[PDB]
Design a protein around this ligand. Structure first.
Ligand SMILES: Nc1ncnc2c1ncn2[C@@H]1O[C@H](COP(=O)(O)OP(=O)(O)O)[C@@H](O)[C@H]1O
Ligand SMILES: Nc1ncnc2c1ncn2[C@@H]1O[C@H](COP(=O)(O)OP(=O)(O)O)[C@@H](O)[C@H]1O
Ligand SMILES: Nc1ncnc2c1ncn2[C@@H]1O[C@H](COP(=O)(O)OP(=O)(O)O)[C@@H](O)[C@H]1O
Lengths: 496, 496, 496
């Protein structure tokens, strides 16, 4: 047990060193005044620390008429990409050292999924309970104010997002505050923050995002025989079998989207206890079974099983909960062959270590739960576009598609004295329903999917030119460093 | 063999006169207060000269600690279209009278290819050699500064680009300077200049842009039997044969893309000497053969041939070098049937004259090397879109496409007791590779081709209208004069 | 006995408590919904902590081509007054916790001398030695940049100033950077920072400013028999006698301006050793004597005396050096009857305590070395005025003055058969030289003393209001709190 701030910092130094020798080179193969390049490693010392961090105290006024001051931080890591992105945390456990780590995390996380934002993160030292809905709103709005005035929020400067401590509403308040104040004259005022309600300029399909990110990330590697050969898989065992720890939003969708492609939830474990059925626990019901109650416990069919499931027999173990739940102790011990980080840093740097050796593939948090970020990028664009995705093209292609099927029809019925004998026109049962109910959402998923795939392959190749086999994490961090580097490099030295 | 400034100015006056009589009419057929429209030629008097030209002297400081002042000009021709476009030249031979001519040239060149920019051009009276890389950067950045402060650079005002004297690099410096200074608050700060590296917001497929522009321009006329009849071509002579003078970026790609479609580089000539093989010099090697050296000379297989190529026996002669290399004297002497201007004004108004008569087709610089401009327009849009072309859509259609092929399959397999007998699903061998490796560049290329063809068509009619035959140039100028006139007409009449 | 951050914090809490009971009243005597005002002490909880503090890391690049990142902080305490004021410190000993304290200090220091600025302070974790003049400049400029972009410098937002670690030139760099960058369009761009050279918009008489502040502060109390009665003075002892510890800029001018009005420097002590003569050490020579050398040591006339001076027999002891050098130990122990804080917090809260009791008057740092701040306010105004003080009026009243003397003359010469017998016209010997060499400086000097004079009796009356007797410090702290309170109250408590 270290703390993030550290792991991330360690994760960087490492990827930084791995890249360096081969960032004098593969690149300026050559150009070499001096052959100190070895040297534009000053670049990497610039990249490392957060460039800006604003701490502030601001007063709100509670409903009981009493004044109270509030502490809050927002740290902008890099600005190599022009608008900073990152969530806002409402917890009494927010430290300046952490918003800084998490800002540091997203700087690279965005790079991984080709999202053109610099990493940022905010924290308000508050516990959203001790405050009413009216009180929460005042905090957000007054917070939005101070950020704007010091350039830590703005559609071209810094675009926040919600954490798990905050909701779409608070984002709505943030947007509405900015648009009615400093950003009155901004035609893109509502692009100042993402994760906001649809009625307020939100994007469709923001909720499945993180979960699907986990899915496609797993799948990209699950269909690569190389990595599946080292574990000896492209699976043979009940076809597939997985356990999910943490039945939050991310874990839920993860189980669902994975189950439906022929994979088997053997066990689901939560904050409380856990459950098991080796037949397949089934999303859905479990799902219903809970909204239904309050927990997963006492589930029919499925079993009080217990402690954590981090080591239930399976292939794919999915941490979708808090931190650190794969330490070192329960490390040589998991089973799961593929550990899919559906949460930020749920494995200590040593779990990685024992895992790496035990010949099991840990799919990095840096890459896997970047699904939400990827879609948040799309929401930001949507606001800049001032139009829902697909609105002007949905009907155009529906026509075009029917026009092809009509063409295949005619062409076949000439070959051939006819009319309406041969009937290609009909789309498949699904193709109809998808043509039928095409919405922005479908584009957003399709975008996410392509991004995950394209990013999955860039990690696989970065891992290979570096001879890295199963340590996807530092390979992922490396892919990030190289990307953040050339932005700095091919920009200049003289001015800023 | 005068100043280039002239030809352009002569080229205009001419197209202006041709349009005029029929710009009292074809338009206000009628409307006629007075019947002086004949008079809203004041419009054409306004269109003609550059509206603004800024000369400036600014100090840099060399690496040897010595101060040195630097002269620089940028001329904005028209602002009928809201952001000015045009390159920056680093040569000691830049005159104020030239940046004006070239600005004048692009003002019409953009109109030809429906690119919504006003013509501009900058020149820094400097020789990039006598200066280090550090020194070059200082010059750019300080130059970018002064332009910004006087409104001669900005994403909505004036968007520069590189010339052959400048690289992507310097464009990167320009962008980074602007974004860190005057345009800090601009959400489109990096749209202030094009031709910049991909890591800095450049567009994929820029390098081939100007070269392909040359290709498609040639091809559009090469597949029209009318124009190919007058020369007696839709070619018969070794199928096809062409000589390229100037092995720069434009000439290189030109030879490659032309060769590829069954056409034959008989000869390649450069700054130094020249080269011949009547079998086909082959891009490629010549290409490699040089990167390789420093020059084309001493090329195996191909021969020390010598002086300029401008009259080597071929059909298509492609000037892709400096100015004026088709004067007058070597005019009734070329052989080439088709002179494809892959550079700005390489033929004097007189070469045109003898050529026109000798019944050979000169494809205008005004239209042909507008390929780079067309794509620069796309780069500008890309920055406004804040997303790479095809991103969110590449996978969406890949799905959609497979969905249709699936539909054609099913539909045919009912006609018919089956399953997977009939197999439409498979795309053609190419359609796969296209779907497979779809990238931004494919979108860029498709856009470039579309523009070049449609402009060729636009030109061909304006030619056949006034029965200009093979006078493609003053047709395209007439085309451009008309377009620039319209915007002026249906707008400013009493003020601004 | 404390450090830095703490004394100030303690100094506030205290004055805050003293004011409170009488800040439900003297004020809203009355108005009392509820009678919880006792409550708009939330105001005082808001006033207390700094509202904003920006930490940043930024790269410079040394002359040896190596990259190096640099840490820097600037804290804005209050913004009840619209442009923040405060110095910039170049020391490796800068903590985030001091820049906050010192920002906190000035927020009240300005209030004391009716200077309408909110307290701020910056620190760059650097040692100006290990860096060349070229290197120092890059640090300043790049630092100025990041402050501007986050709204921590600007003529209407935050106006910095030099500390002892920084000079007028770095201020000049700061101004020139801002004016050439973010604040290019600002007609008051050079009002962004004070303490800059005269050629760069500095004000005349900035150097004597802090020193004279010390003088007039001492003098205001030295001519009040009440306070001079409790010590039993309006002095009788060698008329007067004073020791100065710290021969910096402030201590130097202090000794000079004090000496000049019939007061004796008995002893001068420094960083190194010390010096005594009970006859009078004489500014001037000591002054000359060291420019001369490097130190005060080995001074003729005057003696190696030694250790600190802090207790040499005198009336007035003037700490014009580092912190803390009146602790507690050497507290019941001084003799000086008047301790004039010519530096920030040179007495621990306990020295105050023993002093208060021992019936000796400590003139607060909060009030005394506010002379520099007062004049810095004038420099800010000067830039806003875009004209040197007195320029259009100097000659006008020179004429007016001579016109009165002419009037007195004539009028007397009627009373009386004459012409030019009676001669009032002549000004006094001084009045001539004053009229003769009137400059901006004379206005600046004037404006300062009136401030020090009025602020003096503002504190006297407040000390009187709360029966604080000789607790001049928390008389001044209370005095500031009241001011900052009224601003906060008589405006912003709803959503501001
Ligand atoms: N966060 C980031 N940091 C550094 N580079 C990035 C980041 N996001 C994207 N890039 C880079 O920007 C370049 C330009 O990409 P572009 O073609 O505009 O879209 P895409 O990134 O989808 O290909 C790419 O080479 C990509 O690696
Ligand atoms: N650079 C230009 N200068 C003058 N007129 C132009 C220019 N570009 C386009 N136009 C004219 O303006 C009209 C509006 O263009 P539009 O059809 O909306 O876009 P596009 O030019 O991309 O087809 C076009 O028909 C064209 O004739
Ligand atoms: N930094 C400050 N904080 C709070 N109040 C202040 C500050 N500076 C000045 N004031 C108050 O603002 C008021 C404005 O008075 P004004 O007419 O400007 O007279 P003066 O020129 O003496 O300030 C004064 O009563 C003064 O007490």
């Amino acid at each position: 047990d270290p703390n993030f701030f550290k792991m991330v910092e360690g994760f960087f130094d490492r990827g930084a060193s791995i890249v360096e020798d081969k960032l004098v080179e593969d690149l300026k193969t050559r150009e070499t005044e001096e052959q100190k390049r070895n040297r534009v490693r000053g670049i990497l010392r610039i990249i490392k620390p957060c460039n800006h961090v604003l701490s502030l105290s601001f007063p709100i006024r509670r409903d009981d008429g009493s004044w109270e001051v509030i502490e809050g931080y927002r740290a902008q890591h890099s600005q190599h990409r022009t608008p900073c992105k990152g969530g806002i945390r409402y917890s009494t456990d927010v430290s300046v050292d952490e918003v800084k780590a998490l800002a540091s995390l997203m700087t690279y996380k965005c790079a991984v999924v080709d999202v053109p934002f610099g990493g940022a993160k905010a924290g308000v030292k508050i516990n959203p309970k001790n405050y009413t809905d009216n009180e929460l709103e005042k905090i957000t709005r007054r917070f939005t104010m101070e950020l704007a005035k010091k350039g830590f929020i703005g559609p071209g400067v810094d675009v926040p997002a919600p954490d798990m401590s905050t909701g779409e509403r608070e984002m709505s308040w943030i947007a509405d505050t900015y648009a009615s104040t400093i950003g009155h004259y901004d035609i893109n005022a509502h692009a100042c923050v993402t994760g906001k309600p649809i009625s307020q300029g939100g994007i469709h399909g923001r909720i499945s995002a993180t979960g699907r990110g986990v899915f496609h990330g797993i799948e990209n590697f699950i269909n690569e025989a190389s990595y599946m050969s080292i574990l000896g898989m492209t699976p043979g065992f009940g076809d597939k079998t997985f356990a999910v720890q943490g039945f939050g939003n991310v874990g839920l969708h993860s189980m669902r989207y994975l189950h439906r492609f022929g994979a088997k939830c053997v066990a689901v474990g939560e904050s409380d206890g856990s459950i098991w059925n080796p037949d397949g626990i089934d999303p859905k019901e479990l799902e219903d079974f809970k909204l239904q109650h309050g927990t997963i416990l006492g589930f029919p069919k499925a079993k009080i099983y217990e402690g954590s499931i981090l080591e239930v027999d399976c292939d794919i173990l999915i941490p979708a909960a808090s931190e650190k739940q794969l330490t070192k102790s329960n490390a040589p011990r998991v089973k799961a062959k593929i550990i899919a980080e559906g949460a930020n840093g749920p494995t200590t740097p040593e779990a990685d270590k024992i895992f790496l050796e035990r010949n099991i593939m840990v799919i990095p948090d840096l890459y896997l739960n970047a699904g939400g970020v990827t879609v948040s990028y799309f929401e930001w664009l949507k606001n800049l576009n001032h139009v829902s995705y697909g609105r002007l093209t949905f009907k155009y292609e529906r026509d075009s598609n029917y026009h092809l099927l009509m063409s295949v029809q005619e062409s076949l019925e000439r070959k051939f004295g006819k009319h309406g004998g041969t009937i290609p026109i009909v789309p498949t049962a699904e193709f109809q329903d998808r043509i039928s109910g095409a919405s922005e959402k479908d584009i957003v998923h399709s975008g996410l999917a392509y991004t995950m795939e394209r990013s999955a392959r860039q990690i696989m190749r970065t891992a290979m030119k570096y001879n890295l086999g199963l340590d996807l994490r530092t390979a992922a961090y490396v892919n990030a460093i190289e990307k953040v580097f050339r932005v700095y490099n091919e920009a200049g030295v003289t001015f800023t």
